Amino acid sequence: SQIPASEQETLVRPKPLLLKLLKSVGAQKDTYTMKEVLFYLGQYIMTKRLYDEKQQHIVYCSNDLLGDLFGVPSFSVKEHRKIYTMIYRNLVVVN
């Protein structure tokens, strides 16, 4: 029986600019799961300290490559659906 659709892994290849961003915080591969992309995005925001010091869910990125990739000047980590849309524009899914 096929793995339930909801359970199937989401395998992705970051487009060149997102891949450059992930490699800047240690990623060394071309292909990832969505979980791994999310891990590296967290590492990148943490390392560059793009988050608001007091309201740490809020990320400022108008003067960052992340803003050009996501197409927003800032966002909240709590915006789960929007963050997915922003990430997917920078990924090719691997069948």
Ligand SMILES: CC(=O)Nc1ccc(NC(C)=O)cc1
């Ligand atoms: C470092 C870390 O915690 N990453 C992370 C968190 C939740 C999940 N869950 C599932 C079920 O994918 C996977 C990875």
